[model samples]
Target: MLILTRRVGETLMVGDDVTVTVLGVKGNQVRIGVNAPKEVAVHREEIYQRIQKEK
Candidate 1:
């Protein structure tokens, strides 16, 4: 995995059109926002796994 340091408001760009940004930090938690096109689908990997198991 690639590791780097980023501060609030800094962002990483993926491919031609994806952006992941650091929004805020508080205590032991974090606030983040993801910007993606409507055509793209996003999910938590563990949730996807659980749904498959139910089938």
Candidate 2:
């Protein structure tokens, strides 16, 4: 497993195709934003897992 530590307003890029941003933190939850290509499907983890299971 890999662990990363970041502060608010920091960002991480994935393979030059996607970007994730840390917007804010709320207690145990960390709010985030994802930027990706229009053709790429992006969603929250639980929603993505559900859709993946459907397919």
Candidate 3:
């Protein structure tokens, strides 16, 4: 896994269009904002794992 650090207003781009931004950080919890096209699907880690198991 490649780990990157991003401040509240910093962003990281995925491919040519998708972008992940750090919105806020409070203690151990973090709020992330993602920007992607309608074709892209975003889900929490647990939710994504559940989806994979159902498939």
Considering every candidate listed, which one attains the maximal lDDT? Answer: 2
Pick by TM-score: 1 or 2, better one = 1
What are the lDDT figures for the candidates, one per model?
Answer: 0.75, 0.79, 0.77
Instruction: Give per-residue CA lDDT, model 3, range 3-47, as digits (tens).
Output: 787677878776676787888889799888777877967667875
Model 3 TM-score, all chains together: 0.67
lDDT tens per residue, model 1, 1-55: 9977888778876655667788889968988777877687655677686775684
Off by over 4 Å in 1: 52-55
TM-score of each candidate? 0.67, 0.65, 0.67
In candidate 1 the C-alpha lDDT for residue 27 amounts to: 65
Colliding pairs, model 3: none
Alpha-carbon shift of residue 34 in model 2 (angstroms): 1.2
Clashes of 2: 0
Candidate 1 local distance difference test against the native: 0.75
Q: How many pairs collide in each candidate, listed in order?
A: 0, 0, 0
lDDT of 2 by residue, 1-55 (tens): 8768878887877557888779899989979877677898777677677887895
